[PDB]
């Protein structure tokens, strides 16, 4: 086997890293943040992995919250006019496989521990390009899944597949106890607010226990814009309370005895969309091979980042085992991200689509759920693999063309 470094300790990079410990290969982790500080930190994503996603960490036996977590049962889905409160149409569908959040709080450190009781090497180290260059020399690969950290941006970014060059949303996140569950399966509940923003929520596992974790995406300048003024977790709960009263008052009524999990229970923030070229060339020109977010990053739960990030990670380590003894080239290293591009792109193209407003046919397939549930189950089936949603969701006659048949079904 080889021996491989990766930078970087998050979903991607220690996914790939403990399954190429189990198949023999050596690695070394550098990463800028002990276990022990993940742990005592803020919390970082919503992180809610689709079955597909969640199924790669079970066949590495990585799965070790799956009895602990809550399961997320299902999407429900609202459009929701903000003056009136009115609900264009609703509706909800079971996945057919669940969907599960583990606090990236608790995956991360747990799994750097497994990691070296793998036999893996944990460095703690902020790599900057100095740094990458000592990689560069002692490894036969280098991989950079340093997620939105800003060595990132070292990598080109990509003007032919960026739609967007600033943040598309601002972003809040909070994890509460005692929100009120929904009988009888649990959800994703997303309420599309026009022209205001987004709301969702869904069970999720956390640092003290079960919880809930409630997601704001705000149209930036927007009445969901408001968390640049909040700074005290008290002013935090507050807003997320005070935004669901306005918006969502079904959500709200949910909320009468939330509290936050803890301390670090929250989050707030914004960044541009972007697809970068996966090749980083150093000053030695030598090369660095992006991973995940660090080519590929959107906006949260549409956006996929952990499910994507999971799904990469499998990809990486089947390009990396298959290649054997041969040197892990530029070439390879294209050839490899392409094979994950195959996959995203589809899945970026759907996400972009949801930060800007509906085109019509889209507003009509997601209304027809409202009438049809076996439309309802193929919308929220297809969050465990939104190529699924091409191409009826993105060509107006494809889209006419599936419903005519979804009704003509229906007799
Ligand atoms: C608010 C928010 C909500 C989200 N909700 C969801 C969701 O509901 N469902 C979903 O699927 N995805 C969601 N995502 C996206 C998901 O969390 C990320 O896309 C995913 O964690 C990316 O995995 P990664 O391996 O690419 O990098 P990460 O998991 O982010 O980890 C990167 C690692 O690199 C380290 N690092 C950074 N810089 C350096 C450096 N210079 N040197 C060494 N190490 C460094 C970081 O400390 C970290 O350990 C959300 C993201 C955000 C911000």
């Not at 949303?169 to 509940?189: C, E, G």
């Not at 070439?331 to 991200?337: A, I, K, L, P, R």
């Not at 995203?344 to 509906?358: C, Y």
């Not at 549930?373 to 929220?380: G, P, R, W």
Request: net charge negative; proline share 5%.
């Amino acid at each position: 086997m080889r021996r491989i470094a990766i930078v970087g300790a998050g979903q991607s990079g220690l996914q790939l890293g403990l399954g190429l410990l189990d198949t023999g290969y050596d690695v070394t982790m550098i990463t800028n943040r002990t276990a022990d500080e993940i742990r005592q930190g803020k919390v970082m994503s919503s992180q809610c992995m689709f079955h597909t996603a969640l199924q790669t960490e079970r066949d590495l036996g990585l799965n070790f919250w799956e009895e602990q977590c809550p399961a997320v049962e299902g999407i429900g889905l609202a459009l929701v006019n903000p003056e009136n409160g009115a609900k264009a149409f609703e509706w909800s569908a079971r996945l057919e496989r669940y969907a599960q959040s583990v606090d990236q709080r608790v995956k991360m450190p747990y799994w750097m521990e497994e990691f070296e009781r793998r036999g893996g090497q944990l460095v703690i180290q902020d790599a900057g390009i100095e740094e990458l260059e000592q990689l560069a020399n002692d490894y036969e690969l280098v991989l950079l899944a340093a997620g939105k950290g800003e060595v990132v941006k070292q990598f080109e970014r990509d003007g032919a597949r960026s739609v967007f060059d600033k943040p598309q949303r601002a972003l809040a996140l909070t994890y509460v106890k005692n929100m009120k569950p929904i009988s009888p399966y649990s959800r994703v509940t997303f309420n599309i607010i026009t022209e205001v923003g987004e709301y969702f929520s869904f069970p999720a596992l956390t640092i003290n226990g079960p919880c809930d974790i409630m997601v704001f995406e705000g149209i930036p300048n927007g009445p969901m814009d408001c968390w640049q003024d909040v700074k005290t977790p008290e002013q935090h709960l507050q807003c997320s309370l005070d935004l669901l009263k306005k918006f969502v008052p079904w959500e709200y009524e949910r909320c009468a005895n939330v509290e936050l999990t803890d301390a670090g229970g929250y989050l707030a923030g914004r960044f541009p969309p972007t697809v970068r070229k996966p090749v980083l060339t150093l000053p030695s020109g030598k090369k660095i091979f992006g991973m995940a977010d660090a080519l590929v990053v959107n906006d949260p739960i549409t956006g996929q980042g952990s499910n994507n990030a999971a799904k990469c990670s499998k990809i990486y380590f089947d390009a990396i085992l298959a290649n054997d003894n041969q040197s892990f080239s530029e070439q390879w290293m294209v050839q490899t991200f392409e094979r994950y591009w195959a996959y995203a792109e589809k899945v970026v193209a759907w996400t972009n689509s949801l930060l800007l407003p509906p085109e019509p046919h889209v507003v009509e397939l997601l209304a027809a759920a409202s009438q049809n549930q076996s439309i309802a189950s193929i919308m929220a089936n297809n969050f465990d693999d939104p190529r699924a949603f091409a191409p009826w969701w993105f060509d107006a006659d494809q889209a006419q063309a599936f419903l005519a048949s979804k009704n003509t079904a229906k007799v």
